[PDB]
């Protein structure tokens, strides 16, 4: 992989840039925000999805899809509604792939052309310890034992693992249309010398057959902790 030198090519301040390897920038567009700008609206075709949701859930939905449309604009794609498929996945315009994520203080979208990008998965979470009991439910025993060997003790690697499980599913589902449980992938980590970024690889433990290509046995990705946020990204 290899990220770009930090801040170079006008990436200073861009959190998602620290999980995108240098070789994927030519294929991917991205947009991120740290708040819900006032005045944003859903497209009419998107509005029914949130008709009965509280304002905070509307704001997440509206903002992150505003991001998705900024990214799509950078690739020459006209505004389109981003609906949801039958297991919650974003429905992208013709010929496009992408991933959406949002959490406290972050909204982000990464998009690409199916011609050049097989699949994308991103996830963001606040950089805080997991609530009690959650780690056991989202991890495998061999996973938990190995994280203290590969990850900084100063970081909430339980939250980072969780985030990587989420990014793994988001990259996996558009290619398989099958559910990947938390126990269905074993993720191993690597930490960069600088201590706040690194790599991961998700080893698939179940049938990895895809509708249109070679089976998925492993999915490589990147992780970063910056400005109180954890980010993970997978680009296949
Ligand atoms: Mg998430
Ligand atoms: Mg350790
Ligand atoms: Mg990749």
Curated annotation (Swiss-Prot):
The miscellaneous annotation reads: Identified as a drug target.
Cellular component GO terms held in the UniProt record: enterobactin synthetase complex; plasma membrane
**What is its biological role?**
Transfers the 4'-phosphopantetheine moiety from coenzyme A to a Ser of acyl-carrier-protein. Involved in post-translational modification of various type-I polyketide synthases required for the formation of both mycolic acids and lipid virulence factors. Acts on Pks13, Mas, PpsA, PpsB, PpsC and PpsD. Also acts on AcpM, the meromycolate extension acyl carrier protein. In addition, is involved in the activation of the acyl carrier protein MbtL and the nonribosomal peptides synthases MbtB and MbtE, which are involved in the biosynthesis of the siderophore mycobactin.
Q: What is this protein called?
A: 4'-phosphopantetheinyl transferase PptT
Q: InterPro entries given for it?
A: 4-PPantetheinyl_Trfase_dom, 4-PPantetheinyl_Trfase_dom_sf, 4PPT_N, Enbac_synth_compD-like
Q: Name one Pfam family in it.
A: ACPS
Q: What is the effect of changing residue 179 to L/S?
A: Confers high-level resistance to compound 8918
Q: Which residues bind Mg(2+)?
A: 123-125
This protein's cofactor list reads: Mg(2+)
GO function term, MF aspect, one: magnesium ion binding
This protein's UniProt keywords: Magnesium, Metal-binding, Transferase
UniProt GO BP: enterobactin biosynthetic process; siderophore biosynthetic process; siderophore metabolic process
**Binding site residues for CoA:** 57, 65, 84-87, 101-102, 123, 166, 170, 180
Q: How is its activity regulated?
A: Inhibited by the amidino-urea compound 1-[(2,6-diethylphenyl)-3-N-ethylcarbamimodoyl]urea (compound 8918). It acts by binding to the phosphopantetheine pocket in the active site. Inhibition by compound 8918 kills M.tuberculosis.
The UniProt record lists the EC number as: 2.7.8.7
């Amino acid at each position: 992989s290899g990220l770009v030198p930090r801040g170079s090519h006008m990436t200073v301040g861009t959190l998602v840039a620290s999980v995108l390897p240098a070789t994927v920038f030519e294929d991917l567009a991205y947009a991120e925000l740290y708040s819900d700008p006032p005045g944003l609206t859903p497209l009419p075709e998107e509005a029914p999805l949130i008709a009965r949701s509280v304002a905070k859930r509307r704001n997440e939905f509206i903002t992150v899809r505003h991001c998705a449309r900024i990214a799509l604009d950078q690739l020459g794609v006209p505004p389109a509604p981003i609906l949801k498929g039958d297991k919650g996945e974003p429905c992208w315009p013709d010929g496009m792939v992408g991933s959406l994520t949002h959490c406290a203080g972050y909204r982000g979208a990464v998009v690409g052309r199916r011609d050049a990008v097989r699949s994308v998965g991103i996830d963001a979470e606040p950089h805080d310890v997991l609530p009690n009991g959650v780690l056991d439910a989202i991890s495998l025993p061999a996973e938990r034992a190995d994280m203290p060997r590969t990850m900084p003790a100063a970081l909430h690697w339980d939250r980072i693992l969780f985030c990587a499980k989420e990014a793994t599913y988001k990259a996996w589902f558009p290619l398989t249309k099958r559910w990947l449980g938390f126990e269905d992938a074993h993720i191993t980590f690597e930490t960069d010398s600088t201590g706040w970024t690194g790599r991961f690889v998700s080893r698939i433990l179940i049938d990895g057959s895809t509708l249109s290509g070679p089976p998925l046995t492993t999915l490589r990705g990147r992780w970063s902790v910056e400005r109180g946020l954890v980010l993970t990204a997978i680009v296949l």
